[PDB]
Amino acid sequence: GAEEITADIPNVGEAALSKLDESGIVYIGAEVKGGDILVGKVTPKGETQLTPEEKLLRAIFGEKASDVKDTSLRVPNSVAGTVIDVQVFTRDGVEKDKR
Amino acid sequence: PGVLKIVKVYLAVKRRIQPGDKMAGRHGNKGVISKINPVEDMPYDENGQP
Amino acid sequence: SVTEFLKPRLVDIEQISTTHAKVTLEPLERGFGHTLGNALRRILLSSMPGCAVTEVEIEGVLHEYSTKEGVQEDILEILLNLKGLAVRVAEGKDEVFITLNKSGSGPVVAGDITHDGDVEIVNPEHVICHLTSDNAAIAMRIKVERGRGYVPASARIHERPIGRLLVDATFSPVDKIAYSVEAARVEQRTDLDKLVIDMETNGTLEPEEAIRRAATILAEQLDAFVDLRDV
Secondary structure, three states, rough: OOOOEEEEEEEEOOOOOOOOOOOOOOOOHHHHHHOOOEEOEEOOOOOOOOHHHHHHHHHHHHOOOEEEEEEEEOOOOOEEEEEEEEEEEEEOOOOOOOO | OOOEEEEEEEEEEOOOOOOOOEEOOOOOOEEOOOOOOOHHHHHOOOOOOO | OOOOOOOOOOEEEEEOOOOHHHHHHEEEOOOOOHHHHHHHHHOOOOOOOOEEEEEEOOOOOOOOOOOOOOOOOOOHHHHHHHOOOOOEEEEOOOEEEEEEEOOOEEEEHHHHHEEOOOOOOOOOEEEEEOEEEEOOOEEEEEEEEEEEEEEEHHHHHOOOOOOEEEEEEEEOHHHHHHHHEEEOOOEEEOOOOEEEEEEEEOOEEEHHHHHHHHHHHHHHEEEEEEEHOOO
Protein backbone atom coordinates (compact mmCIF):
# COMPACT_ATOMS: atom_id res chain seq x y z
CA GLY A 1 0.00 0.00 0.00
CA ALA A 2 0.88 3.66 0.35
CA GLU A 3 2.98 4.79 3.30
CA GLU A 4 1.08 7.44 5.25
CA ILE A 5 2.37 10.36 7.31
CA THR A 6 0.12 10.45 10.37
CA ALA A 7 0.09 10.88 14.13
CA ASP A 8 -1.39 7.41 14.80
CA ILE A 9 1.80 5.54 15.71
CA PRO A 10 1.27 2.04 17.17
CA ASN A 11 3.04 1.10 20.41
CA VAL A 12 3.82 4.76 21.15
CA GLY A 13 2.09 6.72 23.91
CA GLU A 14 1.06 10.34 24.23
CA ALA A 15 4.39 11.18 25.89
CA ALA A 16 6.13 10.91 22.51
CA LEU A 17 3.23 12.57 20.63
CA SER A 18 3.47 15.86 22.53
CA LYS A 19 5.64 17.64 19.96
CA LEU A 20 3.88 16.50 16.77
CA ASP A 21 0.86 18.27 15.32
CA GLU A 22 -2.29 16.77 13.79
CA SER A 23 -0.49 15.97 10.52
CA GLY A 24 2.28 14.09 12.34
CA ILE A 25 5.09 16.66 12.05
CA VAL A 26 6.94 18.34 14.91
CA TYR A 27 6.32 22.01 15.61
CA ILE A 28 8.76 24.78 14.75
CA GLY A 29 10.81 25.52 17.84
CA ALA A 30 10.46 22.09 19.45
CA GLU A 31 13.46 21.19 21.61
CA VAL A 32 14.13 17.55 20.75
CA LYS A 33 16.60 15.00 22.10
CA GLY A 34 17.84 11.60 20.97
CA GLY A 35 15.11 9.15 20.00
CA ASP A 36 12.34 11.75 19.77
CA ILE A 37 9.87 11.34 16.92
CA LEU A 38 10.08 14.16 14.38
CA VAL A 39 7.70 12.98 11.65
CA GLY A 40 5.39 10.01 12.15
CA LYS A 41 5.08 7.50 9.33
CA VAL A 42 3.35 4.11 9.17
CA THR A 43 4.03 1.49 6.51
CA PRO A 44 1.62 -1.34 5.64
CA LYS A 45 3.03 -4.78 6.43
CA GLY A 46 2.10 -8.28 5.36
CA GLU A 47 1.21 -11.35 7.37
CA THR A 48 3.82 -12.37 9.94
CA GLN A 49 4.15 -15.91 11.27
CA LEU A 50 3.43 -15.76 15.01
CA THR A 51 5.36 -18.28 17.06
CA PRO A 52 3.04 -20.61 18.98
CA GLU A 53 4.21 -19.29 22.35
CA GLU A 54 3.20 -15.82 21.16
CA LYS A 55 -0.14 -17.08 19.84
CA LEU A 56 -0.70 -18.28 23.41
CA LEU A 57 0.14 -14.83 24.74
CA ARG A 58 -2.27 -13.32 22.20
CA ALA A 59 -4.89 -15.75 23.50
CA ILE A 60 -4.34 -14.80 27.15
CA PHE A 61 -4.18 -11.03 26.61
CA GLY A 62 -6.14 -10.31 23.46
CA GLU A 63 -4.29 -7.20 22.27
CA LYS A 64 -3.19 -7.47 18.63
CA ALA A 65 -2.48 -4.38 16.50
CA SER A 66 0.06 -5.11 13.76
CA ASP A 67 -1.64 -3.86 10.59
CA VAL A 68 1.13 -1.27 10.04
CA LYS A 69 4.75 -0.92 11.12
CA ASP A 70 6.24 2.23 12.66
CA THR A 71 8.92 3.61 10.32
CA SER A 72 9.14 7.21 11.52
CA LEU A 73 11.88 9.82 11.40
CA ARG A 74 13.65 10.00 14.77
CA VAL A 75 16.39 12.23 16.13
CA PRO A 76 19.77 10.43 16.03
CA ASN A 77 21.29 9.34 19.32
CA SER A 78 23.44 11.91 21.13
CA VAL A 79 21.85 14.71 19.07
CA ALA A 80 19.85 17.39 20.88
CA GLY A 81 18.64 20.59 19.29
CA THR A 82 15.81 22.83 18.18
CA VAL A 83 13.66 22.34 15.09
CA ILE A 84 14.19 25.55 13.13
CA ASP A 85 12.49 24.77 9.80
CA VAL A 86 10.23 22.11 8.29
CA GLN A 87 9.46 21.79 4.58
CA VAL A 88 6.90 19.49 2.94
CA PHE A 89 7.09 18.45 -0.72
CA THR A 90 4.04 16.71 -2.19
CA ARG A 91 3.74 14.97 -5.54
CA ASP A 92 1.44 16.51 -8.14
CA GLY A 93 -1.90 14.81 -7.56
CA VAL A 94 -1.51 13.84 -3.88
CA GLU A 95 -3.67 15.38 -1.17
CA LYS A 96 -1.98 18.14 0.82
CA ASP A 97 -2.28 17.55 4.56
CA LYS A 98 -2.95 20.33 7.04
CA ARG A 99 0.71 21.06 7.76
CA PRO B 1 9.12 7.74 -9.19
CA GLY B 2 7.15 6.01 -6.45
CA VAL B 3 7.59 8.86 -3.94
CA LEU B 4 4.37 10.33 -2.55
CA LYS B 5 5.68 12.85 -0.03
CA ILE B 6 8.91 14.20 1.45
CA VAL B 7 9.34 16.07 4.73
CA LYS B 8 12.59 17.81 5.67
CA VAL B 9 13.41 18.91 9.23
CA TYR B 10 16.33 21.18 10.09
CA LEU B 11 17.89 20.72 13.54
CA ALA B 12 20.10 23.40 15.08
CA VAL B 13 22.63 22.16 17.65
CA LYS B 14 24.83 24.33 19.85
CA ARG B 15 28.22 22.67 20.34
CA ARG B 16 30.42 23.84 23.20
CA ILE B 17 34.14 23.21 23.52
CA GLN B 18 35.13 20.07 25.41
CA PRO B 19 38.10 17.71 25.77
CA GLY B 20 38.86 15.91 22.54
CA ASP B 21 38.15 18.89 20.28
CA LYS B 22 40.91 20.14 17.99
CA MET B 23 42.23 23.68 18.29
CA ALA B 24 44.90 25.42 16.27
CA GLY B 25 46.64 28.64 15.37
CA ARG B 26 47.91 29.94 12.05
CA HIS B 27 51.47 28.58 12.40
CA GLY B 28 50.88 24.83 12.22
CA ASN B 29 50.49 24.55 16.01
CA LYS B 30 47.56 22.17 16.49
CA GLY B 31 46.38 20.32 19.55
CA VAL B 32 43.60 18.53 21.38
CA ILE B 33 41.98 19.96 24.50
CA SER B 34 42.89 17.77 27.46
CA LYS B 35 41.20 19.51 30.39
CA ILE B 36 38.79 22.34 31.16
CA ASN B 37 40.52 23.82 34.19
CA PRO B 38 38.66 25.88 36.81
CA VAL B 39 39.57 29.56 36.82
CA GLU B 40 41.10 29.46 40.30
CA ASP B 41 43.59 26.80 39.18
CA MET B 42 45.07 28.64 36.31
CA PRO B 43 48.13 30.91 36.40
CA TYR B 44 47.47 34.59 37.07
CA ASP B 45 49.55 37.75 37.01
CA GLU B 46 50.07 40.46 39.65
CA ASN B 47 46.76 42.14 38.75
CA GLY B 48 44.87 38.90 39.37
CA GLN B 49 43.97 38.37 35.71
CA PRO B 50 44.31 34.67 34.82
CA SER C 1 53.60 35.20 72.88
CA VAL C 2 54.53 32.21 70.72
CA THR C 3 51.47 30.00 71.20
CA GLU C 4 48.99 32.88 70.69
CA PHE C 5 48.52 34.72 67.39
CA LEU C 6 46.91 38.07 66.59
CA LYS C 7 43.62 37.58 64.77
CA PRO C 8 43.16 39.75 61.66
CA ARG C 9 40.34 42.27 61.54
CA LEU C 10 38.56 44.08 58.72
CA VAL C 11 39.99 47.60 58.79
CA ASP C 12 39.02 49.29 55.51
CA ILE C 13 36.71 49.09 52.50
CA GLU C 14 37.49 51.35 49.54
CA GLN C 15 34.88 51.50 46.77
CA ILE C 16 36.71 52.50 43.59
CA SER C 17 33.53 52.04 41.52
CA THR C 18 30.30 50.06 41.45
CA THR C 19 32.19 47.00 40.18
CA HIS C 20 35.59 47.49 41.85
CA ALA C 21 36.55 47.48 45.52
CA LYS C 22 39.43 46.94 47.94
CA VAL C 23 39.22 45.21 51.33
CA THR C 24 41.96 45.46 53.96
CA LEU C 25 42.66 42.82 56.62
CA GLU C 26 45.05 43.71 59.45
CA PRO C 27 47.04 42.53 61.35
CA LEU C 28 48.50 39.23 60.11
CA GLU C 29 51.47 37.19 61.25
CA ARG C 30 54.33 36.00 59.08
CA GLY C 31 53.13 33.74 56.28
CA PHE C 32 49.44 34.00 57.18
CA GLY C 33 48.84 36.77 54.66
CA HIS C 34 49.65 34.51 51.71
CA THR C 35 47.70 31.58 53.17
CA LEU C 36 44.55 33.59 53.83
CA GLY C 37 44.83 35.46 50.54
CA ASN C 38 45.09 32.31 48.45
CA ALA C 39 42.29 30.57 50.35
CA LEU C 40 40.01 33.60 50.01
CA ARG C 41 40.83 33.98 46.31
CA ARG C 42 40.01 30.34 45.59
CA ILE C 43 36.77 30.43 47.59
CA LEU C 44 35.63 33.78 46.16
CA LEU C 45 36.30 32.73 42.57
CA SER C 46 34.47 29.39 42.83
CA SER C 47 31.73 29.31 45.47
CA MET C 48 30.03 32.71 45.53
CA PRO C 49 26.22 32.85 45.29
CA GLY C 50 24.43 35.20 42.95
CA CYS C 51 21.45 35.79 40.69
CA ALA C 52 21.23 35.17 36.96
CA VAL C 53 18.81 35.13 34.04
CA THR C 54 17.63 31.59 33.31
CA GLU C 55 14.56 31.72 31.04
CA VAL C 56 13.22 34.33 28.61
CA GLU C 57 9.85 34.56 26.85
CA ILE C 58 9.59 36.99 23.93
CA GLU C 59 6.23 37.52 22.26
CA GLY C 60 6.15 36.19 18.71
CA VAL C 61 9.39 34.23 19.15
CA LEU C 62 9.49 30.43 18.93
CA HIS C 63 13.22 29.68 19.07
CA GLU C 64 16.53 31.50 19.40
CA TYR C 65 17.57 31.09 15.75
CA SER C 66 15.05 33.64 14.51
CA THR C 67 14.53 37.34 13.85
CA LYS C 68 11.96 39.90 14.97
CA GLU C 69 10.87 42.80 12.77
CA GLY C 70 12.30 46.14 13.82
CA VAL C 71 15.03 44.55 15.98
CA GLN C 72 18.55 44.66 14.60
CA GLU C 73 19.86 41.86 16.85
CA ASP C 74 18.93 38.20 16.53
CA ILE C 75 17.32 36.47 19.50
CA LEU C 76 20.64 34.71 20.11
CA GLU C 77 22.30 38.12 20.45
CA ILE C 78 19.53 39.36 22.74
CA LEU C 79 19.96 36.35 25.03
CA LEU C 80 23.73 36.86 25.06
CA ASN C 81 23.13 40.49 26.05
CA LEU C 82 20.72 39.40 28.79
CA LYS C 83 23.44 37.10 30.14
CA GLY C 84 25.28 40.27 31.17
CA LEU C 85 22.46 41.57 33.34
CA ALA C 86 23.41 42.43 36.92
CA VAL C 87 20.41 41.81 39.19
CA ARG C 88 20.24 41.85 43.00
CA VAL C 89 17.22 40.00 44.40
CA ALA C 90 16.05 40.61 47.96
CA GLU C 91 16.79 37.86 50.46
CA GLY C 92 14.30 35.03 50.87
CA LYS C 93 13.43 34.78 47.17
CA ASP C 94 15.24 32.31 44.91
CA GLU C 95 13.03 33.12 41.91
CA VAL C 96 11.60 36.28 40.35
CA PHE C 97 10.02 37.44 37.10
CA ILE C 98 10.61 40.82 35.47
CA THR C 99 9.17 42.33 32.31
CA LEU C 100 10.60 44.46 29.50
CA ASN C 101 8.22 46.28 27.15
CA LYS C 102 9.47 48.95 24.77
CA SER C 103 8.23 50.54 21.55
CA GLY C 104 9.87 53.05 19.24
CA SER C 105 13.31 53.53 17.75
CA GLY C 106 16.25 53.51 20.13
CA PRO C 107 18.50 51.31 22.26
CA VAL C 108 16.52 49.10 24.63
CA VAL C 109 18.59 49.04 27.83
CA ALA C 110 18.34 47.46 31.28
CA GLY C 111 16.83 50.60 32.79
CA ASP C 112 13.60 49.87 30.90
CA ILE C 113 12.89 46.68 32.88
CA THR C 114 9.93 46.87 35.26
CA HIS C 115 10.71 45.23 38.61
CA ASP C 116 8.60 44.60 41.71
CA GLY C 117 10.72 46.48 44.27
CA ASP C 118 12.51 43.32 45.42
CA VAL C 119 14.76 43.44 42.34
CA GLU C 120 17.53 46.00 41.82
CA ILE C 121 19.22 46.48 38.44
CA VAL C 122 22.87 47.37 38.97
CA ASN C 123 23.68 48.39 35.36
CA PRO C 124 20.75 50.35 33.88
CA GLU C 125 22.96 51.48 30.98
CA HIS C 126 23.50 47.91 29.76
CA VAL C 127 22.17 47.73 26.20
CA ILE C 128 19.88 44.75 25.63
CA CYS C 129 18.80 45.36 22.04
CA HIS C 130 18.11 48.02 19.39
CA LEU C 131 14.79 49.01 17.83
CA THR C 132 15.35 50.38 14.33
CA SER C 133 11.77 51.36 13.48
CA ASP C 134 9.17 53.61 15.06
CA ASN C 135 6.59 50.83 14.65
CA ALA C 136 8.84 48.23 16.30
CA ALA C 137 7.79 46.79 19.66
CA ILE C 138 9.41 44.32 22.06
CA ALA C 139 7.78 42.50 24.97
CA MET C 140 9.83 40.05 27.04
CA ARG C 141 9.35 38.16 30.31
CA ILE C 142 12.63 37.37 32.07
CA LYS C 143 13.21 34.86 34.87
CA VAL C 144 15.93 35.51 37.46
CA GLU C 145 17.05 32.80 39.87
CA ARG C 146 19.52 32.56 42.73
CA GLY C 147 22.27 29.99 42.39
CA ARG C 148 25.96 29.22 42.62
CA GLY C 149 28.50 28.43 39.93
CA TYR C 150 27.93 27.86 36.23
CA VAL C 151 24.81 25.88 35.33
CA PRO C 152 24.46 25.31 31.58
CA ALA C 153 21.00 24.88 30.11
CA SER C 154 21.87 21.34 28.98
CA ALA C 155 22.72 20.31 32.56
CA ARG C 156 19.32 21.37 33.93
CA ILE C 157 17.10 18.41 34.78
CA HIS C 158 14.06 17.94 32.54
CA GLU C 159 6.60 20.23 30.26
CA ARG C 160 8.07 23.29 28.53
CA PRO C 161 5.91 25.29 26.09
CA ILE C 162 7.46 26.32 22.79
CA GLY C 163 8.63 29.90 23.21
CA ARG C 164 10.40 29.56 26.53
CA LEU C 165 14.10 30.04 25.78
CA LEU C 166 16.71 28.75 28.21
CA VAL C 167 19.73 30.93 28.98
CA ASP C 168 23.06 29.65 30.30
CA ALA C 169 23.48 30.94 33.85
CA THR C 170 26.74 32.09 35.43
CA PHE C 171 25.61 32.82 38.98
CA SER C 172 28.97 33.80 40.48
CA PRO C 173 29.19 37.61 40.78
CA VAL C 174 32.97 37.64 41.24
CA ASP C 175 34.97 38.33 38.08
CA LYS C 176 38.53 39.05 39.23
CA ILE C 177 40.35 38.68 42.56
CA ALA C 178 43.83 39.93 43.40
CA TYR C 179 45.63 40.05 46.73
CA SER C 180 48.78 41.78 47.98
CA VAL C 181 50.61 41.35 51.28
CA GLU C 182 52.32 44.50 52.53
CA ALA C 183 54.08 45.56 55.72
CA ALA C 184 51.98 46.64 58.70
CA ARG C 185 52.84 49.24 61.35
CA VAL C 186 51.32 47.92 64.58
CA GLU C 187 52.58 49.05 68.01
CA GLN C 188 56.30 48.22 68.06
CA ARG C 189 56.60 44.85 66.30
CA THR C 190 57.66 44.63 62.66
CA ASP C 191 56.67 41.02 61.88
CA LEU C 192 53.02 41.94 61.27
CA ASP C 193 51.50 42.13 57.80
CA LYS C 194 48.49 43.52 55.95
CA LEU C 195 46.36 41.87 53.25
CA VAL C 196 44.69 43.93 50.51
CA ILE C 197 42.11 42.15 48.36
CA ASP C 198 41.13 43.84 45.10
CA MET C 199 37.75 42.55 43.92
CA GLU C 200 36.17 43.22 40.52
CA THR C 201 32.57 41.97 40.46
CA ASN C 202 29.27 42.78 38.74
CA GLY C 203 28.17 44.99 41.65
CA THR C 204 25.56 42.61 43.04
CA LEU C 205 27.60 41.37 46.02
CA GLU C 206 29.01 43.69 48.67
CA PRO C 207 32.73 43.32 49.44
CA GLU C 208 32.41 42.80 53.20
CA GLU C 209 29.58 40.29 52.77
CA ALA C 210 31.68 38.38 50.24
CA ILE C 211 34.61 38.23 52.67
CA ARG C 212 32.43 36.93 55.51
CA ARG C 213 30.80 34.29 53.29
CA ALA C 214 34.22 33.07 52.13
CA ALA C 215 35.45 32.93 55.73
CA THR C 216 32.33 31.02 56.78
CA ILE C 217 32.85 28.46 54.01
CA LEU C 218 36.49 28.01 55.00
CA ALA C 219 35.65 27.61 58.70
CA GLU C 220 32.90 25.09 57.97
CA GLN C 221 35.25 23.02 55.82
CA LEU C 222 37.99 23.18 58.47
CA ASP C 223 35.51 21.94 61.09
CA ALA C 224 36.08 18.44 59.70
CA PHE C 225 39.81 18.69 60.44
CA VAL C 226 39.27 20.19 63.90
CA ASP C 227 37.41 17.00 64.87
CA LEU C 228 39.44 14.36 63.03
CA ARG C 229 37.86 10.94 63.57
CA ASP C 230 37.02 7.86 61.54
CA VAL C 231 33.64 8.34 59.86
